[PDB]
Amino acid sequence: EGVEPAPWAQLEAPARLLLQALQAGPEGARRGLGVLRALGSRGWEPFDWGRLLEALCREEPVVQGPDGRLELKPLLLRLPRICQRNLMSLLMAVRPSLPESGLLSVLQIAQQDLAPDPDAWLRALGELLRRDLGVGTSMEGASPLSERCQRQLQSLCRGLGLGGRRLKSP
């Protein structure tokens, strides 16, 4: 009646482990690693990240909010939220070892530009991958954080006598 199979049901089996694994609470991220070493040890010694990096961006249909509103969601926002947060962890963990083409397609989504209720976390780890690639200096106020944070931290730094250190170079 209301069976849905997981979004990764149709995928090539080792993805299905990776993301099956990252479903599971905050140690998701090791388990993701655990899987990578456990598939260097099984017969497909490689894992085709360009398979998985397409699959993530590709969109499918969803009908949510009311009973009636058609939208096109990509995989990344559609799959389990804890699998998001750890994926993104793991990708700082193997950033070197992915092609750029895919990453950038991921991030752009991540940015969650032009959403109501963006996902803080994702945006942030988006930022923290941009800042590791060397292409998302972004020339903005683009730091992982909330504005409401940024300001409350300036507000308390101000209650202290500045260090003679020189760190800004105008």
Binding site: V3, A6, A13, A21, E27, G34
Partner: protein, 126 residues
């Protein structure tokens, strides 16, 4: 590459100490003209064994979900009825895996359902 790597140690907490200490002492005696091994042999003041066991090197004799031995007195005990997987598991890990999957089906105090690694019938009796 030749530069010092981040390196850290698994095994007996008693055996790990002196090596972890001598590293601390000898780290400034790293050099990038000699190889990684020709720096490591004279830094840790040891030799390594040249495939000490090449057949049973190590079988990750670990849960294949949590990748740990000893989950709460449970050992990697629960296995696959398959020559090509043979992957141990724990009761708890494998129960929380197969019960989540759609494929698996539950008898009275048994779960028949797919081995995570190889997708073959595996049975769990609680």
């Amino acid at each position: 590459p030749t530069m010092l790597p981040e390196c850290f140690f698994l095994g007996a907490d008693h055996v790990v100490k002196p090596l972890g200490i001598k590293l601390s002492r000898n780290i400034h005696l790293w050099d990038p003209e000699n190889s990684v091994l020709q720096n490591l042999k004279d830094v840790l003041e040891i030799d390594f064994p040249a495939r000490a066991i090449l057949e049973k090197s190590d079988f990750t004799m670990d849960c294949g979900i949590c990748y740990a031995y000893q989950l709460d007195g449970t050992i990697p005990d629960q296995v696959c009825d398959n020559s090509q997987c043979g992957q141990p598991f724990h009761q708890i890990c494998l129960y929380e895996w197969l019960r989540g999957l759609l494929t698996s089906r539950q008898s009275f105090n048994i779960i028949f359902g797919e081995c995570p690694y190889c997708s073959k019938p595996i049975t769990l009796k609680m």
